[PDB]
Amino acid sequence: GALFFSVSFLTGYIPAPNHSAILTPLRSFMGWFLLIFCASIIIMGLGKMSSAISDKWFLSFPLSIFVIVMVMFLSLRVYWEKGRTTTVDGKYIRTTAELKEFLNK
Amino acid sequence: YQIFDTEKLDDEQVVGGHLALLGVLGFIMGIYYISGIQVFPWGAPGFHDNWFYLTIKPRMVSLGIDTYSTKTADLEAAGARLLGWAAFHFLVGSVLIFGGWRHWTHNLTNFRDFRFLGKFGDVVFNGTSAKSYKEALGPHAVYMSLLFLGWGIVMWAILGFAPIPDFQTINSETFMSFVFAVIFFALGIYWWNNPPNAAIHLNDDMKAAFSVHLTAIGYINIALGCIAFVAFQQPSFAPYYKELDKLVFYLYGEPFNRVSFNFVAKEFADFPAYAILPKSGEAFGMARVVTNLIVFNHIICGVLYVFAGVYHGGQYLLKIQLNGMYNQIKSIWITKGRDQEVQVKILGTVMALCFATMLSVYAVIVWNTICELNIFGTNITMSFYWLKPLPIFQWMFADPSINDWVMAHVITAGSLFSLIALVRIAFFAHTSPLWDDLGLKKNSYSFPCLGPVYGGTCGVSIQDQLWFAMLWGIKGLSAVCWYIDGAWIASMMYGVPAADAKAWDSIAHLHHHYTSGIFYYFWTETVTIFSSSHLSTILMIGHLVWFISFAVWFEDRGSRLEGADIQTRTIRWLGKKFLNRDVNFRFPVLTISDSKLAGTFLYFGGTFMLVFLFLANGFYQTNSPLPPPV
Amino acid sequence: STKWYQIFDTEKLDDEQVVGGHLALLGVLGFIMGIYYISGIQVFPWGAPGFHDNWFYLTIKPRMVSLGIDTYSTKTADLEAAGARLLGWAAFHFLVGSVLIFGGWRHWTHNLTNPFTGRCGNFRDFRFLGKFGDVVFNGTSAKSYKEALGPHAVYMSLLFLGWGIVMWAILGFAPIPDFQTINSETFMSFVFAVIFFALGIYWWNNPPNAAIHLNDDMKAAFSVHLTAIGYINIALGCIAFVAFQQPSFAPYYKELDKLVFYLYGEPFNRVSFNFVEQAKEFADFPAYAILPKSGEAFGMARVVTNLIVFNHIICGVLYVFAGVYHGGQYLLKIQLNGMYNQIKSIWITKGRDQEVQVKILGTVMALCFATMLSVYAVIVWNTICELNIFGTNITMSFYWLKPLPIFQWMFADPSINDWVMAHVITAGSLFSLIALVRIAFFAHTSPLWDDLGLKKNSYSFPCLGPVYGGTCGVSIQDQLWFAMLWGIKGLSAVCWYIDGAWIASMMYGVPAADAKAWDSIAHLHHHYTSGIFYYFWTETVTIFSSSHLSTILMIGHLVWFISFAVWFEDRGSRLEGADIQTRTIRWLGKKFLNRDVNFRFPVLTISDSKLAGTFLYFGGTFMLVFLFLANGFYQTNSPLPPPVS
Ligand code: BCL
Ligand code: BCL
Ligand code: BCL
Ligand code: BCL
Ligand code: BCL
Ligand code: BCL
Ligand code: G2O
Ligand code: G2O
Numbered sequence A: 001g002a003l004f005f006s007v008s009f010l011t012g013y014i015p016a017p018n019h020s021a022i023l024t025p026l027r028s029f030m031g032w033f034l035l036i037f038c039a040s041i042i043i044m045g046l047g048k049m050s051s052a053i054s055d056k057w058f059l060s061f062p063l064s065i066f067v068i069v070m071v072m073f074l075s076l077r078v079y080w081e082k083g084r085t086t087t088v089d090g091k092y093i094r095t096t097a098e099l100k101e102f103l104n105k
Numbered sequence B: 001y002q003i004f005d006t007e008k009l010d011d012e013q014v015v016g017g018h019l020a021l022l023g024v025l026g027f028i029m030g031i032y033y034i035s036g037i038q039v040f041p042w043g044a045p046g047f048h049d050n051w052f053y054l055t056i057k058p059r060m061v062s063l064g065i066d067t068y069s070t071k072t073a074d075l076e077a078a079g080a081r082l083l084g085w086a087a088f089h090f091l092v093g094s095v096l097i098f099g100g101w102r103h104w105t106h107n108l109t110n111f112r113d114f115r116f117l118g119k120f121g122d123v124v125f126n127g128t129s130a131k132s133y134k135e136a137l138g139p140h141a142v143y144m145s146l147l148f149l150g151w152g153i154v155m156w157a158i159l160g161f162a163p164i165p166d167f168q169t170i171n172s173e174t175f176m177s178f179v180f181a182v183i184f185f186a187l188g189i190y191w192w193n194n195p196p197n198a199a200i201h202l203n204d205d206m207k208a209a210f211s212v213h214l215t216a217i218g219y220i221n222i223a224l225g226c227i228a229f230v231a232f233q234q235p236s237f238a239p240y241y242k243e244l245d246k247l248v249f250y251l252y253g254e255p256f257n258r259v260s261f262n263f264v265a266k267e268f269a270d271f272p273a274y275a276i277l278p279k280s281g282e283a284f285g286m287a288r289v290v291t292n293l294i295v296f297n298h299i300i301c302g303v304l305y306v307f308a309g310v311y312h313g314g315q316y317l318l319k320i321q322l323n324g325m326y327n328q329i330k331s332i333w334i335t336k337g338r339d340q341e342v343q344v345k346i347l348g349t350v351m352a353l354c355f356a357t358m359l360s361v362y363a364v365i366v367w368n369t370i371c372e373l374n375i376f377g378t379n380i381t382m383s384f385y386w387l388k389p390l391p392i393f394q395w396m397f398a399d400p401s402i403n404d405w406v407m408a409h410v411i412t413a414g415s416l417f418s419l420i421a422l423v424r425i426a427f428f429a430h431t432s433p434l435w436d437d438l439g440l441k442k443n444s445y446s447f448p449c450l451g452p453v454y455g456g457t458c459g460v461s462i463q464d465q466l467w468f469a470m471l472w473g474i475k476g477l478s479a480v481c482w483y484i485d486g487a488w489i490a491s492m493m494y495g496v497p498a499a500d501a502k503a504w505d506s507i508a509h510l511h512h513h514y515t516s517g518i519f520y521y522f523w524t525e526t527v528t529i530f531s532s533s534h535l536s537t538i539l540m541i542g543h544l545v546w547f548i549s550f551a552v553w554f555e556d557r558g559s560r561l562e563g564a565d566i567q568t569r570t571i572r573w574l575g576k577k578f579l580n581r582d583v584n585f586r587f588p589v590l591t592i593s594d595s596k597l598a599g600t601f602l603y604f605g606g607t608f609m610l611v612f613l614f615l616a617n618g619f620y621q622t623n624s625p626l627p628p629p630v
Numbered sequence C: 001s002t003k004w005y006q007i008f009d010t011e012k013l014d015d016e017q018v019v020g021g022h023l024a025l026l027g028v029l030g031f032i033m034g035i036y037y038i039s040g041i042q043v044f045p046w047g048a049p050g051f052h053d054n055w056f057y058l059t060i061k062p063r064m065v066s067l068g069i070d071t072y073s074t075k076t077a078d079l080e081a082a083g084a085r086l087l088g089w090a091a092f093h094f095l096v097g098s099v100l101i102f103g104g105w106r107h108w109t110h111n112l113t114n115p116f117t118g119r120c121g122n123f124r125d126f127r128f129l130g131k132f133g134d135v136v137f138n139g140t141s142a143k144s145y146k147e148a149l150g151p152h153a154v155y156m157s158l159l160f161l162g163w164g165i166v167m168w169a170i171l172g173f174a175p176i177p178d179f180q181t182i183n184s185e186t187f188m189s190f191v192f193a194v195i196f197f198a199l200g201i202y203w204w205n206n207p208p209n210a211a212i213h214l215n216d217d218m219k220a221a222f223s224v225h226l227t228a229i230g231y232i233n234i235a236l237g238c239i240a241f242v243a244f245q246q247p248s249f250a251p252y253y254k255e256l257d258k259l260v261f262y263l264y265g266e267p268f269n270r271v272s273f274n275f276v277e278q279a280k281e282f283a284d285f286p287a288y289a290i291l292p293k294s295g296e297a298f299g300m301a302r303v304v305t306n307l308i309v310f311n312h313i314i315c316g317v318l319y320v321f322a323g324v325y326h327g328g329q330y331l332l333k334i335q336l337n338g339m340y341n342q343i344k345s346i347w348i349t350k351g352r353d354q355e356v357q358v359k360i361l362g363t364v365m366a367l368c369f370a371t372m373l374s375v376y377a378v379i380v381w382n383t384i385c386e387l388n389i390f391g392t393n394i395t396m397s398f399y400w401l402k403p404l405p406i407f408q409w410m411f412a413d414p415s416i417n418d419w420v421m422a423h424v425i426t427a428g429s430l431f432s433l434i435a436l437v438r439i440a441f442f443a444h445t446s447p448l449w450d451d452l453g454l455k456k457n458s459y460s461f462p463c464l465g466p467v468y469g470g471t472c473g474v475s476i477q478d479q480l481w482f483a484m485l486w487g488i489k490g491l492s493a494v495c496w497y498i499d500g501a502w503i504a505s506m507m508y509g510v511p512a513a514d515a516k517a518w519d520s521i522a523h524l525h526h527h528y529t530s531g532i533f534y535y536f537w538t539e540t541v542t543i544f545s546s547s548h549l550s551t552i553l554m555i556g557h558l559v560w561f562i563s564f565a566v567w568f569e570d571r572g573s574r575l576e577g578a579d580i581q582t583r584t585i586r587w588l589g590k591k592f593l594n595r596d597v598n599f600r601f602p603v604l605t606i607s608d609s610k611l612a613g614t615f616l617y618f619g620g621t622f623m624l625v626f627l628f629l630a631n632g633f634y635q636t637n638s639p640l641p642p643p644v645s
């Protein structure tokens, strides 16, 4: 997909506000490459895993999947969504009555 | 389903069938014409409106048979003209059916050598007939010249239109009909002085000629659909179409004037009980609706005709491969696939190019979706919004955007995807490289299984490949429908309530607000469908047909066979219990080839039964773009 | 042909091997439970916020509230106490699961040596404990599953007593016989400990005899226990739906509606293209932060109830189907082995006569056909009447058809909807039972295959060819797939009913007149969310609103229409297409590779194609049904007025 930058230069488009025009085709090509690369990784890894799994893999499969989901939740707190959605004044409004109170405001 | 096989019919049988069918077409044309007369000359209320007649109506407006005028007397005069023309169609169709029966049944008087309009039939064609098809191309062209000349003289004499050659009026149709009569006459006289040379359709040729002509007609129908979509959008055709937006239409199955339960109350005043409620044409965009119906009908009919032409050509190819005629065809249309190495090259190239472009466009679509829903923290600035048709290609599209790019790439990918199966039909009809490697050849146009071997061998036959071609072209036809109904095919959820879903209009600065993304289009069309009971019934019936197709689609016929044996035993036992020795009613389970036939029939039938609802709910595309979400 | 889904097959495993596998699974499950408990920490004991309300934890939550853990408190100190208890119990689960995984590995290796005392413990002979085993059993179950039921019930009694003790000491719930309050589950745990100890000692002194399973327990006992526990799971789902709707559970479930949740993937406050964090919708919350979703509008109580109930229900139905399939596999094994004629028990001898099989399957088919035709005619007639086609108003519909007053006790608002729900459940049960009976009886030879001289010689053979124009999918595996597809309808009915939908008609609530007048003529205080077809339109509002649910929607749909490719009769077409693909990839030769491309494009076997097709079909269908149950309850207790007075 080395030609994406060229066609971006040849197309007449207005970039998104306050976003670099140079990196936009880079972003889109990175997304396309990521999608194709992750699909290929999934296909190849599962093709190799079908043949690599055995009775000696009994110690690996459950625990490895556990590790995957463990770091998945850890990422859910680490990089993806951090916090309890604290209110800017500082709160964790859990009671719906407070939600009506701030719908009044 | 093979009762009208070409090998069973002679040429005169084909002539008779075609004549009977043209007569019945005239009869149903009269049926539609009398089904569209808004107010009778009697003065009584007439037929409300039909999608048949709403499709036909712009043509009658162009021809002056029917008018869009707002005067009751004008509509009565239009109905009188409609009834007169319907009676003419009825009578001429009756005559055509009479000829069809006199030709299907060989009772006349010389079909091998005859005279056609002998007074000048000795001037043209030397007072003799067209012995063979190559000699028949000439007289066929001259007959079409006579048809064009007849249209011209009828338009001038009965419809009273001028021969003015300016291409912004029906007088253009008159002038060009005369010009086409002249051109067809020239082509026919040349062909009579020199018959063509494509010998493959001059031997036993019914299936071969039928296949090639059906493919040509299918491509002609696709071209006609594109041409009609462009022209019906042109301002010159606007007087005959855009007035559909300016008129109201009362269609069957619309929400009736809702009655009460203690009624001798009604919803709307002065409109009687159970009365079809009025609809404004501006809300439906009835001009776009009608052109969508016509164009998509032509497009799907062309696609199906191409697929069936390829299938019948594959049938003929298998026939000439079985009796050894394949290896002695001097026509280039066989020499380019006889080597069986160019076949592999062609199919592999088509598969690879289809794979590349389809993977590219699918990746673009899913990335647009991901940037839409902010999955994995992707903003809308990460999408393919820079990606547009080039200015060189921009003249093809109005309001150029990623939508048009994805539409073009998707339709090309779908064409190539169906072409994969079409080429498989075209080349591997008797010999396939795998089946040459396996040592097993094929001998029937419908051999479904050939047993579970090398993992299984389902669906190798020509007929099964036709079914697969139709299945894969369903996606291309859906793309066509969704583009002509205004759906945003570039992404999956556009205009949906979510983050950065409206933002497209603020990002691409579009002058046309498209309806919805792929998955939000169903919702935004069913919001209008569910009002109509008729469209709802079509919706449910289409889904019913679709899922009943799966009982014969899946690899389950044997399970159905043993279950039918069990059902037969149960029925026999019970009918012998409560009734005396009644033994009958074996449960019939369709064979696997017939199972695929029925499955494709139901699948296509339902799917496009529902696509009709997509194309008939309304356009519902606004010119005002969505605001930024900010 | 040993595939990657046959390496863990029981035929290759011993009793100790499966013991080790079960213990490894229990430990891994404990580790996963620790993950979930950590995921439920709303405020970290460090003094910081917590995790964003995973569906896993949102399901786990009310049960934790039943215990001393996980207070329904907006007060930060008490919520920190909740987090502390959750984290501590998660660490305890982690430790116990680690020890369980260690024991599972020891039993997988058949290496049972105690580090403190260098002795080897024989699996066939041992004492359960130093003195307790000699007190109760004086030995070990003699390697026979029937003799183990006693000790197994004794161990279950021990576990019940331990649960009572844990509730008494750590969780502080004193057993009292008041069954409305929480502090009776421990009293009933003690009662069950007594009852199951009695049953265990009785079964140890008097082992029940069903000699079919003992020989090849690995499949026969597996099938029987799996079907039994599938029905147990269905019963647990029903009991859960009834109880979670009771006022006794209300302090632990209705309060879930009172409190709001910040879910992962729930829509965030949307910033503009130019947000100078040095324009933002909902500025009070921080940028790209999850907007609260109110439980009262979301119906979180019934959403969690539905998730639990349908999880257990579908797991039970799948377990029933798998039990029938594995029993069919065992029956095929003994049919090829000649042991089918030698079983000598009622569970086989009754089905040994093919005419009895014919009678049973014919009765099931007749009942299924009659009930299905009746209920389907009712549904389509209601749809016709409400859409008014053929000139029929809803007065001609089946609104009069209520459940019988004697049978009305088990419904909230008696209506045609409950009637159709019950009839559809019975019809779908019999519909799947047709294929389950086919697996049970026709594992080797159907009466057709008795008349036509063929016999099924494998559990995963594709077919028998195009002979007789059929033979597709007569393998017990393929009958299982058909049973699963047939029970998809029943599971869908279950989900739509528990979520709230008008199953008696198709388009209920559409802008048509008599569709809206259904409630007016039916006299219902409950307004069902919508009809069968209108259910999607009404319940996809939230699914579209939430980006995460839309992502699941797309992925499930992709999975389904990829299942389509392997479900159809196209394997040979795909094989020749793959050969063409291989030939063009070899045509990458002379594209300047100089590398022999030894990559044959693979195409799945039909026995594998149906496997993948069913797995993806079920997976997409119920990945989407998860969104059905996660859209919300959205049932308002307000009857609809007639459109026209
Ligand atoms: C022969 C079958 C039936 C019949 C069935 C139909 C059907 C079906 C339809 C009509 C329609 C019409 N018919 Mg009629 N009709 C018949 C007999 C007649 C007679 C008569 C002399 O008795 C008349 C005056 C008419 C008149 C009319 C018009 C009111 C109307 C529009 C015609 C027009 O566009 O034609 C223009 C005429 C021509 C261009 C003549 C040449 C035809 C060309 C060759 C057709 C193929 C073109 C395509 C591009 C492929 C070319 C491929 C190769 C390159 C050559 N029909 C008989 C009874 N009638 C149409 C309709 O109602 O529109 C809404 C319509 O589609
Ligand atoms: C112009 C574009 C096509 C073309 C269009 C058609 C179409 C379209 C049909 C045929 C049909 C036939 N074609 Mg042709 N035909 C072409 C060129 C050829 C050539 C040739 C090149 O010389 C040959 C040898 C043939 C050969 C044949 C025969 C196999 C058959 C006529 C026999 C008969 O009994 O049919 C008569 C058979 C019918 C009466 C049954 C099928 C039609 C329907 C079911 C009935 C018509 C009424 C209709 C449903 C009423 C409308 C109701 C409203 C929708 C509410 N075609 C080109 C390639 N031909 C017909 C046939 O059935 O093929 C199998 C047919 O339908
Ligand atoms: C353009 C004119 C016609 C056409 C005319 C014919 C004729 C005539 C015959 C067939 C026949 C067949 N047709 Mg065809 N066919 C067309 C469209 C198609 C399409 C399609 C693109 O979807 C398909 C899949 C088929 C399928 C088939 C097969 C069943 C069969 C050919 C087998 C083989 O060995 O071919 C090998 C051939 C090829 C690989 C292509 C050959 C192309 C020739 C050499 C022309 C030059 C190509 C060049 C790029 C064009 C430049 C433009 C110039 C102006 C010429 N047709 C169009 C509509 N077809 C044969 C049969 O038996 O019919 C029953 C037959 O005799
Ligand atoms: C309700 C309790 C159920 C039950 C629930 C489960 C569950 C749940 C699991 C097993 C597992 C196994 N069970 Mg069991 N099983 C029951 C009754 C039995 C009986 C019997 C009474 O005769 C026997 C002999 C077995 C035998 C077995 C083996 C096939 C396997 C463990 C040994 C091994 O080391 O695996 C070698 C391999 C491993 C231990 C791990 C391999 C990797 C992963 C974890 C396998 C997951 C498969 C699948 C996704 C499980 C999904 C459940 C669904 C979500 C509903 N089960 C009871 C009635 N059993 C596991 C197994 O492997 O299933 C195929 C498994 O998943
Ligand atoms: C067992 C495998 C895993 C594990 C996985 C799970 C799972 C999975 C769950 C818990 C949950 C619980 N775990 Mg734990 N947990 C383990 C180890 C432990 C140990 C321990 C010292 O071993 C303890 C004290 C606990 C403590 C607890 C509680 C905090 C909590 C509720 C228990 C309860 O209601 O049981 C009830 C006890 C009984 C019914 C009696 C004992 C079991 C009897 C003998 C077996 C039959 C009943 C069976 C469970 C249900 C079948 C009913 C049919 C009608 C037959 N875990 C190991 C590491 N833990 C629950 C949760 O968090 O809820 C939200 C939960 O569902
Ligand atoms: C009731 C307790 C258990 C049960 C316990 C067993 C036992 C024990 C055995 C089987 C075995 C089998 N099980 Mg079972 N099984 C149950 C539920 C089912 C269901 C179901 C969906 O209801 C199905 C389809 C199956 C399927 C099967 C077959 C694979 C196989 C029997 C074949 C045969 O010839 O049967 C012939 C048919 C019968 C004998 C039917 C009649 C049943 C009883 C004996 C008679 C009285 C019941 C009466 C008819 C119904 C009304 C009263 C009831 C109390 C409700 N199980 C429940 C969960 N199953 C056997 C096998 O080999 O496993 C691998 C085996 O060893
Ligand atoms: C509503 C649509 C459907 C039916 C109607 C039906 C009828 C039926 N089928 Mg089916 N089926 C699917 C849908 C329907 N299958 C799908 C979408 C799949 C994809 C996986 C599928 C798959 C398999 C496999 C693999 C096997 C079968 C059988 C088997 C039966 C045998 C006896 C039986 O089940 O009695 C129980 C009786 C019923 C199942 C039918 C009662 C009528 C009802 C009220 C709905 C009426 C629908 C419609 C109005 C009728 C037509 C009139 C008008 C519209 C022109 C049997 C009556 C097989 C056997 O013969 O043995 C069981 C077998 O092996 N299937
Ligand atoms: C997303 C859905 C689908 C594909 C992806 C696909 C891929 C594919 N198939 Mg398919 N298929 C259906 C859906 C899909 N079939 C349905 C619903 C039916 C029911 C009728 C069906 C049936 C048949 C028959 C009967 C035959 C085939 C073939 C054939 C190909 C050979 C080369 C080609 O056509 O490339 C053109 C196709 C591609 C560009 C596909 C690769 C990227 C893609 C753009 C989208 C990427 C989606 C992604 C891979 C999913 C997960 C990503 C990640 C998690 C790993 C070939 C690449 C056969 C042959 O080998 O020759 C054509 C053959 O005989 N089919």
Ligand code: SF4
Binding pocket: B448, B449, B450, B451, B452, B456, B457, B458, B459, B555, B556, B557, B592, C462, C463, C464, C465, C466, C470, C471, C472, C473, C569, C606
């Ligand atoms: S179509 Fe059916 S019988 Fe034929 S090979 Fe496929 S599964 Fe076997």
Ligand SMILES: [Ca+2]
Binding pocket: B485, B525, B613, B614, B615, B616, B617, B618, B619, B620
């Ligand atoms: Ca529309």
Ligand SMILES: [Ca+2]
Binding pocket: C499, C539, C627, C628, C629, C630, C631, C632, C633
């Ligand atoms: Ca819902």
